[PDB]
């Protein structure tokens, strides 16, 4: 359990 | 360790002391002994029983020769009972009286290719709230890079039923020796008309 929220590294795969 | 081969015939409830007892009826007797396993000959101890007489046409030479070493008429099924050496050369329902407890062994009803819900009681997925084509699906089957594989014996969909099942410690409700019947309280594996094995229980 990690207390500091972990930012995402990828944007949601967006339709080209 | 007494034992007998018989076919399961169907279920009912008799009445006994103002209580209805679910029973299944087993045509047990009679079972001629056709070979005996002894420690000299075979290392262990067991009796080869036969069951249901058979049209001598349908029995090849080698099988028919087996019966002749014992003077038994051609029979349909041959089965051993381990650590059983009866006094006579015919096992019948008489070796069981009411009150006794038995183990009954039979080939279960085959459910064929069974999904993970019917076979392993999994819960599947939601039926709304977004669930997408996984309604009867198992879910995850592993972890990630470690171990990076699926455990042996991982419960999955596949064939389910038509396997051996022994249901144990069933009360012997009645015995009808004139009819070679054998009442048994409760459920017994296999369909009606399926060959079961009735043995003395191993409980307390």
């Amino acid at each position: 359990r990690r207390i500091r929220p972990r930012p995402p590294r990828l944007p949601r795969p967006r339709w080209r | 360790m007494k034992g007998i081969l018989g076919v399961k015939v169907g279920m009912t409830r008799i009445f006994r002391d103002d209580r209805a007892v679910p029973v299944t009826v087993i045509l047990a007797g009679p079972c001629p002994v056709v070979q005996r396993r002894t420690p000299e000959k075979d290392g262990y101890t067991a009796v080869q029983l036969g069951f249901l007489p058979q049209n001598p046409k349908r029995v090849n030479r080698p099988l028919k020769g087996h019966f002749a070493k014992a003077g038994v008429e051609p029979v349909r099924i041959l089965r051993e009972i381990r650590d059983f050496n009866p006094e006579g050369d015919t096992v019948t329902v008489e070796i069981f009286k009411p009150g006794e407890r038995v183990d009954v062994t039979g080939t279960s009803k085959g459910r064929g290719f069974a999904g993970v819900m019917k076979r392993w009681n999994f819960a599947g997925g939601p039926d709304s709230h977004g669930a997408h084509k996984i309604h009867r699906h198992p879910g995850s089957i592993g972890n990630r890079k470690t171990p990076g594989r699926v455990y042996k014996g991982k419960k999955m969909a596949g064939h389910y039923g038509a396997e051996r099942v022994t249901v144990m410690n069933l009360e012997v409700v009645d015995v009808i020796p004139e009819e070679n019947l054998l009442l048994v309280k409760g459920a017994v594996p296999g369909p009606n008309g399926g060959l079961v094995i009735v043995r003395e229980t191993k409980k307390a």
Partner: protein, 122 residues
């Protein structure tokens, strides 16, 4: 088959009218309470100035269920509703009467005060 969230009719003069099951007192993780089982419930509707009021947390015993209860003789008996009688921590009724039949199973479970108070024990 009473499980939490199930509404029940109260068959006594304790004030209550409907109670809502929130726990079946049958060990760790029992699924449903049949006739004779004890439940903690919430008083959802009740007449004014009763021995119990709206919003209490009472215990009760399930006297009759809408699911049929079976019996070792081979018979079975279902009722038209699921009902209960408010009790105390000593299993005794908290009213002075009960209304409508109660299942005979209460006696075998030891609720003789309720069973005697009934109009019919089926």
């Amino acid at each position: 088959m009473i499980q939490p969230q199930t509404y029940l009719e109260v068959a006594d003069n304790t004030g209550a009218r409907k109670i809502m099951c929130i726990r079946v007192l049958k060990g760790s993780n029992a699924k449903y309470a049949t006739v004779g089982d004890v439940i903690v419930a919430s008083v959802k509707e009740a007449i004014p100035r009763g021995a119990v009021k709206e919003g209490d947390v009472v215990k009760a015993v399930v006297v009759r269920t809408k699911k049929e209860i079976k019996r070792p003789d081979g018979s079975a008996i279902r009722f038209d509703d699921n009902a209960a009688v408010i009790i105390n921590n000593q299993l005794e009724p908290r009213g002075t009467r009960v209304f409508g039949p109660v299942a005979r199973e209460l006696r075998e479970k030891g609720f003789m005060k309720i069973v005697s108070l009934a109009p019919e024990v089926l």
